[model samples]
Target: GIQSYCTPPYSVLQDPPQPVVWRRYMLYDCVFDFTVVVDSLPTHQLQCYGVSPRRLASMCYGSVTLDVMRINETHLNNLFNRVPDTFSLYNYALPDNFYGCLHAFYLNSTAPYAVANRFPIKPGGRQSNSAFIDTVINAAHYSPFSYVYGLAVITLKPAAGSKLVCPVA
Candidate 1:
């Protein structure tokens, strides 16, 4: 199995501009193999995560999976006020378990503004029983200072599907 490993302890660069040397070692064995599968779509759609209303007030963290459909380059460019050459959905974060808080973000950047979006989860992990999430983004509540690219990342969870949890931190 291909297990995951963290970045090793080594400095790759120093005071040198655009050039430096460092050493690193694989600290652990690869245990999981990740595979990506793509599906063909006829029309684009927006999907958000499901969350228990009671949990919203108790904690400030939880995790949701967004079914990223695709993006409208023009809307994205207009939202950002400039044409972003490229972008990506890196990773996400959540508090702990049910009744916890939630947030998402790009993997590389630390800008506090542009976190990721959330999707819905149904009661029993059933596909067709899913419902659309009432997210803040859809209501145009996010601030202009935040990254505008998230409107494009689209993922939909089926009703009655398993709850999407944040990857182990």
Candidate 2:
């Protein structure tokens, strides 16, 4: 038993926590900041969050670059304590459907956890029509922390340009 004395691990349940050397760790910032031109007379805009721009599959913009996206093991694995093998990653999300004016999409995961990619129309987060779309795809469907979400795969579609070069912070 211990008295209610104020100390380092306040509010937390355990002492020292699992951050000890025996274990390892992981700043994945999903929060993004978007910019736009407000209709104000000044013609100057400011900072905010909204449906990210879509990366057009083919357009009068940037060149074509085939993105080989991957979802690392940390996201999924009901085996070997997350290390033993690369033979994990729920191949089910491989539904591989990036709808709305897209092309050359391939989900060559080699294996399949095998499942459908559909959730309720409304997602649990900030308001954005975009949320309804990806809410169906995010691996957080079961849990968050999936590399797929971090990678381009989240909004790989032309309708969700949420990241590139560096996450939009």
Candidate 3:
């Protein structure tokens, strides 16, 4: 279900690329619907992709925020066993469009992980941003009980004119 919605629509690849044309239709707050679980050890590297190509026009700018919506209570308890008292974000990575990791702090509960960047990605290219959550858990038993759902929010710069179409359009 998440994959279906995460895949960029064919319309985005149209000639002259219309990422700005249907920006509202493509931007979404609840972009991820999957859960992150550990199958083996205490560490789980969760990776998620955006459904549509995020456009940061030369004149436009924005920030991408990743929120950890919920963590199973049982999982939180188990994580506490291995971690210090509270849960924490060990490390993270961003896609090419983004420059580098922004912030990673303890997330024993629902919290926001944010990454801010300019439109460094190549223009007119169909590209999607990738997010990776590298977590560390020492005990194996705590692994099974850990589960999480992440939310992605992309905020774009506001338009300068009342018209939706560009000057040429």
Best by TM-score: 3
- Candidate 3 stretches with Cα past 4 Å from truth are 1-89, 92-144, 160-169
Model 1 lDDT vs. the true structure?
0.23
Model 2: CA > 4 A from native: 1-64, 68-70, 74-116, 119-131, 137-144, 147-169
State which candidate, 1 or 3, has the greater lDDT.
3
Summing lDDT over every window of 10 consecutive residues in candidate 2, give the lowest-scoring window. 18-27
> Against the true structure, what is each candidate's TM-score?
0.18, 0.16, 0.20
How many backbone clashes does every candidate have? Answer: 35, 2, 3
Better of 2 and 3 by lDDT: 3
Task: Estimate the lDDT of model 3.
Answer: 0.25
lDDT rank order: 3, 1, 2
Which 10 residues in a row give candidate 1 its minimum summed lDDT? 13-22
Model 3, position 117, has a per-residue lDDT of 25
Tens digits of per-residue lDDT for model 1, 37-132:
111111122222344423322322222222221122333343234232222211121112322111122222222232223333222121121122
Worst 10 residues of 3 by lDDT: 13-22
